[PDB]
From Swiss-Prot:
A motif (BH4) lies at residues 5-25. The keyword Transferase does not apply. It comes from Mus musculus (Mouse). Widely expressed, with highest levels in the brain, thymus, bone marrow, and kidney. Bcl-X(L) and Bcl-X(delta-TM) expression is enhanced in B- and T-lymphocytes that have been activated. Potent inhibitor of cell death. Inhibits activation of caspases. Appears to regulate cell death by blocking the voltage-dependent anion channel (VDAC) by binding to it and preventing the release of the caspase activator, CYC1, from the mitochondrial membrane. Also acts as a regulator of G2 checkpoint and progression to cytokinesis during mitosis. Isoform Bcl-X(L) also regulates presynaptic plasticity, including neurotransmitter release and recovery, number of axonal mitochondria as well as size and number of synaptic vesicle clusters. During synaptic stimulation, increases ATP availability from mitochondria through regulation of mitochondrial membrane ATP synthase F(1)F(0) activity and regulates endocytic vesicle retrieval in hippocampal neurons through association with DMN1L and stimulation of its GTPase activity in synaptic vesicles. Keywords: Apoptosis, Cytoplasm, Cytoplasmic vesicle, Cytoskeleton, Membrane, Mitochondrion, Mitochondrion inner membrane, Mitochondrion outer membrane, Nucleus, Phosphoprotein, Synapse, Transmembrane, Transmembrane helix, Ubl conjugation. A motif (BH3) lies at residues 33-47. GO terms for biological process: apoptotic process; apoptotic process in bone marrow cell; cellular response to alkaloid; cellular response to amino acid stimulus; cellular response to gamma radiation; defense response to virus; dendritic cell apoptotic process; dendritic cell proliferation. The gene is Bcl2l1. It is a single-pass membrane protein. Belongs to the Bcl-2 family. One of its GO terms (molecular function) is BH3 domain binding. The chain holds residues 1 to 196 of 233 of the full protein. This is Bcl-2-like protein 1. It is found in: Mitochondrion membrane; Nucleus membrane; Cytoplasm, Cytoskeleton, Microtubule organizing center, Centrosome.
């Protein structure tokens, strides 16, 4: 399924980001997409250094936060619709939310942000991804 493999991209990117940053990932061709996406998230974070401080303060995530609040905040990245750069920003933002969750001693949220990201990607982003050549196109652009 497209939807299972999207779930796998999310868990890979999150695990990679948590490992990279000194955190545990223990609550958790494909290989080329995963590799492209890890690298694309590194490049974006080094260059743009976005804290997404607007989005994070709007969501102010806690174990009581519902998917619909996550969805509403993420939509702000897509207010002019989807493109590849905004998808990269969405993965990097979810990795930032996992890191912030552990830092707020809300480690329970990591697993939940992973499900929420997979839900949002499969629902809102996959239609555009498929229309635009699927994840192969992401590899064509990002190496």
């Amino acid at each position: 399924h497209m939807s299972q493999s999207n779930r796998e991209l999310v868990v890979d990117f999150l695990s990679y980001k948590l490992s990279q940053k000194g955190y545990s990932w223990s609550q958790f061709p494909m290989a080329a997409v995963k590799q492209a996406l890890r690298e694309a998230g590194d490049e974006f974070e080094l260059r743009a250094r976005r804290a997404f401080s607007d989005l994070t303060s709007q969501l102010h995530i806690t174990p009581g936060t519902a998917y619909q609040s996550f969805e509403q905040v993420v939509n702000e990245l897509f207010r002019d619709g989807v493109n590849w750069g905004r998808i990269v920003a969405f993965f990097s933002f979810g990795g930032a939310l996992c890191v912030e969750s552990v830092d707020k001693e809300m480690q329970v949220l990591v697993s939940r942000i992973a499900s929420w990201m997979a839900t949002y990607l499969n629902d809102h982003l996959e239609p555009w991804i498929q229309e635009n050549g699927g994840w192969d196109t992401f590899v064509d652009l990002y190496g």
